[PDB]
């Protein structure tokens, strides 16, 4: 899981942000941090220098009012992915805006500020007679053929065998 | 050349392209047989044609079945050269080990793919409704399961199953039809229930409220224009037939229903992550598209849970694919190569490497 951000999230302490572009975990440049395009969804990592030495992680998904829906999922998943290349021990929190916890919202001194646009997605009769009906049913007999166009499944197997050696 | 993702429930395969916002197919899982068909032309045929679901309550039961569907899926209805595409499949809550290990040893050995994974359907569903928490009810044709999900993992020892599902609900849509004196039971028929079902059917807020607004105005009441020109009155039995689902027990079912069911999840799991699951409710699968069935579930947990919990039932209307889009997003994130399963692993460890990469 070799990633290239992978291998920068959570070395140092201090404040990583991400942006999802299009199916991608890309750096937002650090000028940057603190405004966030209301149609994306982003990653944020806080790390803290435990008094044992230890790195104490926060791993947040913040998701745009207007962000699609591959991006809220990317966003979740890569949170999911990078707790796991942690050893687990992050904590994950789902920021939606307009909701966000203190804890988020403390990580911006000057202020988070909101802001409309971003990254386009990744994606791309009377009473009922039943005989008047059943006739129907039952009047589509020499109608249909098969299909034509196909491959019929004859048990080939192409792949190389993996012998339980 | 890109990847692919199947997601096979018990009474449709969805099947497409990762990257993609829907499966580019979608198609009955049956196998007839008077040769063989599949799929469309099979569910064409069926009065001619002994069916057979290889797909039994989410598990895979036939295995011969299986592989012609996957076939099918791949040459017939998505077109590809499985060889050239790294696939990923679906599978349920709890799948035994050994379907499997049988799933990897085919895709790879029948099918050659260069690469495979298989996901947990309630956990892509979660995944597609951008949350890594929360307990997902997945209710398919044939089964219907609550899952608890916490950080992206689901706990295996709180995940709860009912044996009831959409399949249920059109058997029981169709005797009530006879009850009320419209006699479909015969297979030509059948879709007709089903479509009566997934159309003019609705959950309601109170049960016995609608049942009294029912035979006390006829306000309630539709009608269905049938193939053949006919036109027949629908009563109270639109919520009737799902209102099963929060009372097994119109089809006999001593089992509990759905929002009990959640509930029993719910306290099945540890006390710090009640409260994120309350919250976070997923419903996920063709037998959760009812029209009121959120409001509904939400009333029913309201009820059930203590006074200051925040609950939510999530709902979200393309929820029929939520299974096979969170696969498509899994599958085409930039981290995601390395998580595949390929052909040089697979053939030096055997379909055993299945437990160990994907779960
Ligand atoms: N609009 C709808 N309203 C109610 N039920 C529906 C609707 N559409 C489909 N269903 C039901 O949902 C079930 C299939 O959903 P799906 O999740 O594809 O099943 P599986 O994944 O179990 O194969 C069927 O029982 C079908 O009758
Ligand atoms: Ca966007
Ligand atoms: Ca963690
Ligand atoms: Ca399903």
Redesign the pocket.
Same mark, same amino acid.
């Given at each position: 899981v070799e990633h290239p951000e992978f291998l920068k999230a959570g070395k140092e302490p201090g404040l990583q942000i991400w942006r999802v572009e299009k199916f991608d975990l890309v750096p937002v440049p650090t000028n940057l941090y603190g405004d966030f395009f209301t149609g994306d969804a982003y990653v944020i990592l806080k790390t803290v220098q435990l008094r044992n030495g230890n790195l104490q992680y926060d791993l947040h998904y913040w998701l745009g009012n207007e962000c699609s829906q591959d991006e809220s999922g990317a966003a979740a998943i890569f949170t999911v992915q990078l707790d796991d290349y942690l050893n687990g021990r992050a904590v994950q929190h789902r920021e939606v805006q307009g909701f966000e916890s203190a804890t988020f919202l403390g990580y911006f001194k000057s202020g988070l500020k909101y802001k409309k646009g971003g990254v386009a997605s990744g994606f791309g009769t009377g009473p009922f007679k039943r005989e008047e009906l059943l006739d129907h049913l039952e009047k589509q007999a020499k109608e249909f053929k098969d299909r034509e166009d196909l491959v019929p499944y004859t048990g080939e197997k192409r792949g190389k065998v993996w012998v339980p050696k | 050349t890109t990847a692919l993702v199947c997601?096979?429930?018990?009474?449709?395969?969805?099947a497409g392209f990762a990257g993609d916002d829907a499966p580019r197919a979608?198609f009955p899982?049956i196998v007839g047989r008077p040769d063989s068909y599949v799929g469309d032309e099979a569910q064409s045929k069926r009065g001619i044609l002994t069916l057979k679901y290889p797909?039994e309550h989410?598990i895979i039961t036939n295995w011969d079945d299986m592989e012609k569907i996957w076939h099918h899926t791949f040459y017939n209805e998505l077109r590809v050269a499985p060889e050239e595409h790294p696939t990923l499949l679906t599978e349920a809550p709890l799948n035994p080990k050994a379907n499997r290990e049988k799933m990897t040893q085919i895709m790879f050995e029948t099918f050659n793919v260069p690469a495979m994974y298989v996901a947990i359907?309630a956990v892509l569903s979660l995944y597609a409704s951008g949350r890594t928490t929360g307990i997902v009810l997945?209710?398919?044709?044939?089964?219907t399961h609550n899952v608890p999900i916490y950080e992206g993992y689901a706990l295996p020892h709180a995940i709860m199953r009912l044996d009831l599902?959409? !399949?249920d609900?059109?058997d029981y849509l169709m005797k009530i039809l006879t009850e009320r004196g419209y006699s479909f039971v015969t297979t030509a028929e059948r879709e007709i229930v !089903?479509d009566i079902?997934?159309?003019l059917?609705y959950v309601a807020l109170d049960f016995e409220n609608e049942m009294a607004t029912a035979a006390s105005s006829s306000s309630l009441e539709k009608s269905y224009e049938l193939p053949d020109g006919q036109v027949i009155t629908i009563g109270n039995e639109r919520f009737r037939c799902?209102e099963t689902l929060f009372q097994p027990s119109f089809i006999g079912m001593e089992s509990a229903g759905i929002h009990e069911t959640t509930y029993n999840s719910i306290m099945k799991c540890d006390i710090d992550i009640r409260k994120d699951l309350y919250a976070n409710n997923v419903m996920? =699968? =063709?037998?959760?598209?009812?029209?009121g069935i959120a409001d509904r579930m939400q009333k029913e947990i309201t009820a059930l849970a203590p006074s200051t919990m925040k609950i939510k039932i999530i709902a979200p209307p393309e929820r029929?694919?939520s299974?096979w889009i969170g696969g498509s997003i899994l599958a085409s994130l930039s981290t995601f190569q390395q998580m595949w399963i390929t052909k040089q692993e697979y053939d030096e460890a055997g379909p055993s490497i299945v437990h160990r990469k994907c779960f």
């Open positions: - | 997601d096979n429930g018990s009474g449709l395969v969805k979608v899982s797909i989410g359907q997945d209710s398919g044709d044939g089964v599902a959409g !399949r609900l059109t !089903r079902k997934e159309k059917c799902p996920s =699968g =063709g037998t959760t598209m009812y029209p029929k694919y299974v």
